Amino acid sequence: FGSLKDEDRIFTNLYGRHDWRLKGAQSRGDWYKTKEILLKGPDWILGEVKTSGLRGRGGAGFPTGLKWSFMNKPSDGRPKYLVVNADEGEPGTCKDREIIRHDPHKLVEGCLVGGRAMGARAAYIYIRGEFYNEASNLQVAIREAYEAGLIGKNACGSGYDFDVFVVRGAGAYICGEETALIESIEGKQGKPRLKPPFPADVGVFGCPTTVANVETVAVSPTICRRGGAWFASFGRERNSGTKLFNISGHVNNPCTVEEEMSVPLKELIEKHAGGVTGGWDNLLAVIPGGSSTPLIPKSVCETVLMDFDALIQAQTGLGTAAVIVMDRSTDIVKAIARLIEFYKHESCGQCTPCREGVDWMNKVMARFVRGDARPAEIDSLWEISKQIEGHTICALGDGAAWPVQGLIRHFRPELEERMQQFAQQHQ
Amino acid sequence: VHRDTPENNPETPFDFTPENYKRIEAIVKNYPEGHKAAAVLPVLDLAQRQNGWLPISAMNKVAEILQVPPMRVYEVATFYTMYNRKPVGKYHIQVCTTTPCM
Amino acid sequence: PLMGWASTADPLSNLVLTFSTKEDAVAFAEKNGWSYDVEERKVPKPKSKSYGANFSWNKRTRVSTK
């Protein structure tokens, strides 16, 4: 990992933000060399990302480099599409929508340059309609370029070019899975399918699709434009790259910054800009993932670098790329229930473990917080959480327990004493 | 809230402005043919827009356009959130309350 | 005609013996010497059922709202 950073220069993977929002020639960075890329054999791009080997921003492992050079090697009778989440499911994510808001010109390229690797046919994106204003403008961004003849059907210089069809959702979590999105792109109700039909690259719209994420297809052109040998810059021999973090919930100026891997949380939280709560003596009870990781106390987290597998060393890792912390007044038990009260409303409801199994917790979590009937429950409530893992289809269950699974870990007494606080009270 | 209708506007009636039948040419043009069969997500919502909340005769209408048995619509309008089945106001306001927002 | 219990003769009327197989089934009708009849065992077709054929390009089997 080198020098234990993760610095930020003007040399980064994102071109500009406050400079130019509208269309043009991509005055400096973008749309630079194209006809040379596409005219060379497609699999040249395939595995040429391996110089980086992006883990992927979809909240998981499984480097993006494999799945595209993965099946969808051949082609037979039926077209292939691209479905790239723009959605945000996790509370406090916020990383998305900043990419789109002030610089859309990147991703329409990101597909066209990207889609050629798939050998795909069309391009769908998807956006939660809950963003009405910013999402409305992409069409202009599509038009303001696409109208110039930059895309389709040969554009430019190849015999292969195809346009991008925006769509919208409503009350979606649906980006909560692939093999759901490709279902509610269709117009059924969205109940995500079983994971191994034929996994997500066989059963699809009518025909094989691949579900990418935003900065997985956003940073691909610039990492195939230059690459290197700088493609692997920070992070150890395992995880490599520089992703975006967006700090939220206590800071001086919670705001995004581009930061490379293996950055410790004690300098990163304090920096960009201040630590404005107590940098210490505010107890710094932290959540690595947005909703997908339980607490860490004042322990090795602060020295624990943000590298992925570095977090699997602790009791939980995070792929979500977000930060929420706390200081003093926020009662964690009080502040984790409204993370659970959230889950109960976003779940499909097919499976018997998820449905009727999350409420069993959510109905009891309003006992502990309020303070109420006796311990030895905690010992059970742990087993429930241990009882939903292989039992649910999607990850929302595997992402349902961890907050409670990792609350019972790391804080014993805060509960034990409160059940007394109402016990002595009853007396 | 309850998800059954007490026969409010079975015939409201309702219809789309003839300015809107020229866009639905464009929506269906997105998709491939023969699978079209659901554009329902924009098309059902565009109807909310023309009105401002969609009564039960709105749910029955698009079926005559999209030829799907209209329990393959009443379903989709009771899953998502953004659609408002009951009437509403001129401003429908939200307060984000969640762990960070808390 | 006092209560409505349905009283009866036909003193067998309730016996079910249980044999293990046909070859040894008829074994006990002859050996005790009364008439009889036979039915046949039934088991299903093989059969062929595959999930994941339910989402199809040109096939006519394509389910919605499952």
Binding site: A122 | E25, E33 | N58
Partner: peptide, 28 residues
């Protein structure tokens, strides 16, 4: 900013410039 009026967004440049589609069939 334009509350209604997705029209030309959907039907102006998109309508003419979304070729072909071939999209096949799927009769079914």
């Amino acid at each position: 900013y334009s509350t209604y009026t997705f029209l030309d967004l959907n039907l102006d440049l998109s309508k003419f410039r979304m070729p072909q589609p071939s999209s096949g069939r799927e009769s079914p």
